[PDB]
Amino acid sequence: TPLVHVASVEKGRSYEDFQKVYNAIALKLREDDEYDNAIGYGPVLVRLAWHTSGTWDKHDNTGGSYGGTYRFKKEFNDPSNAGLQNGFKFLEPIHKEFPWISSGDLFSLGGVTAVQEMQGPKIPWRCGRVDTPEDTTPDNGRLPDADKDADYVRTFFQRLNMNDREVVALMGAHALGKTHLKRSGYEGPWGAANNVFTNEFYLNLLNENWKLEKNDANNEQWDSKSGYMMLPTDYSLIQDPKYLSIVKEYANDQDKFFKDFSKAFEKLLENGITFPKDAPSPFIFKTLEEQGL
Ligand code: HEM
Ligand SMILES: COc1ccccc1O
Ligand SMILES: COc1ccccc1O
């Protein structure tokens, strides 16, 4: 008997309230611009949204974004979550200013805000995640290993109810940020921009000259002469013929990648949540730039 998690709108809140939270996150992203050699907190916030959602299991509705369970020791100490404390620390003053927003709503909204502020697609977002108790925290080990092949990636993502297109689209988030040796045992950025959301991940996969090397942690990763890297799981997207077709598609159509990423990312963030028939429609937040702020 899977759990049922029903979205419940924070009492009396509407679009304007959530746009204010978005704005606070966005303003702080602009302000705190030295973090991680001037990449800023955008990428780590996207990773935090993904890891807080990616614990979901479709079979029994355990894990997922709803409960905001990353706030609990077992989950924030997950080896898979190493470094995400930076995203959590970033969000702390946001939580303090807006203590009415649920933890799940805040983690997921952090990811949406980061993507949009980094010039990515609009990501419609729905409120109503409700904090669940410590004993609802999923055990460690539900997040994916990076040292694996296409078969692993495909099978892994079936648990999150993602198909090939959704997987390939979601992986394009690797345009953002970088791997850090001390966090994950991998080192280097996937591309040049780091804090601009584009289809660069796919272009780099297809266009760079990759060499399978060992990093300083004795793990294999694919390295280019440009100083970029790909995880074995990234590289598997061009080894598998079905993934490869989709990589080529996104490398050659920026708009299509944006549309597909937006759908898959919202889906990821909403997995496991039952929205009542009379729940508000998804919100689409204006960027700071769109507001002249
Ligand atoms: C097979 C699936 C995936 C694997 C194995 C994987 C693995 C990793 C690893 C090892 C890192 C480096 C962590 C570090 O050293 O800081 C990383 C970073 C990152 N991941 Fe993925 N990931 C996967 C899918 C995703 C998805 C679906 C998203 C979001 C849509 C995502 C977003 C990010 C972002 C933005 C970073 C950079 C974080 C930063 O710069 O602080 N990843 N991932
Ligand atoms: C300076 O870093 C950022 C600014 C706005 C959005 C995301 C970032 O990483
Ligand atoms: C419950 O406190 C938090 C939740 C989500 C993000 C930052 C926080 O301080």
XYZ file of C-alpha atoms and ligand atoms in Angstrom, residues 35-36 43-44 46-47 50-51 82 144-146 152-153 156-157 170-171 173-174 176-181 183-186 190 231 233 261 265 268, ligand 1:
79
model
C 31.169 30.659 -3.910
C 32.931 27.792 -5.744
C 24.293 24.614 -9.782
C 24.392 23.316 -6.190
C 19.731 22.493 -8.863
C 21.575 19.435 -7.555
C 17.277 16.829 -7.798
C 18.697 14.866 -4.859
C 28.216 15.329 -0.036
C 22.674 6.906 -8.716
C 26.333 5.798 -8.963
C 28.435 7.582 -11.617
C 22.377 0.958 -15.265
C 21.206 4.509 -16.043
C 17.862 3.323 -12.394
C 15.584 5.947 -13.933
C 17.464 15.681 -17.258
C 21.163 14.860 -17.683
C 21.655 19.807 -16.172
C 25.309 18.777 -16.240
C 25.934 23.446 -14.735
C 28.653 23.527 -12.095
C 31.302 20.837 -11.816
C 32.459 17.694 -10.068
C 34.646 18.187 -6.984
C 37.152 15.463 -6.113
C 32.796 15.397 -2.743
C 32.262 12.601 -5.277
C 35.668 11.246 -6.360
C 35.417 13.039 -9.726
C 31.434 19.424 -18.012
C 31.297 10.800 -15.888
C 27.254 7.621 -16.844
C 13.965 19.640 -19.731
C 12.326 18.626 -14.239
C 10.898 14.973 -11.164
C 22.892 8.956 -13.741
C 22.460 10.077 -13.150
C 23.406 11.089 -12.452
C 24.600 10.851 -11.876
C 25.348 9.500 -11.781
C 25.096 12.105 -11.348
C 26.290 12.289 -10.680
C 26.830 13.501 -10.312
C 28.115 13.696 -9.670
C 29.103 12.565 -9.283
C 28.275 15.013 -9.475
C 29.471 15.739 -8.835
C 29.238 16.038 -7.358
C 30.399 16.870 -6.871
O 31.546 16.366 -6.849
O 30.191 18.054 -6.516
C 27.111 15.696 -9.993
C 26.921 17.055 -9.982
C 25.794 17.717 -10.413
N 24.600 17.131 -10.808
Fe 24.472 15.142 -11.456
N 24.166 13.090 -11.624
C 23.113 12.508 -12.294
C 21.986 13.174 -12.720
C 21.670 14.507 -12.503
C 20.369 15.117 -12.696
C 19.140 14.314 -13.162
C 20.459 16.435 -12.383
C 19.356 17.526 -12.396
C 18.422 17.622 -13.348
C 21.833 16.680 -11.986
C 22.375 17.890 -11.603
C 23.665 18.107 -11.179
C 24.266 19.416 -11.014
C 23.646 20.790 -11.284
C 25.675 19.156 -10.513
C 26.756 20.190 -10.177
C 26.637 20.510 -8.690
C 27.686 21.516 -8.276
O 28.383 22.075 -9.161
O 27.794 21.774 -7.054
N 22.527 15.485 -12.063
N 26.242 14.741 -10.485
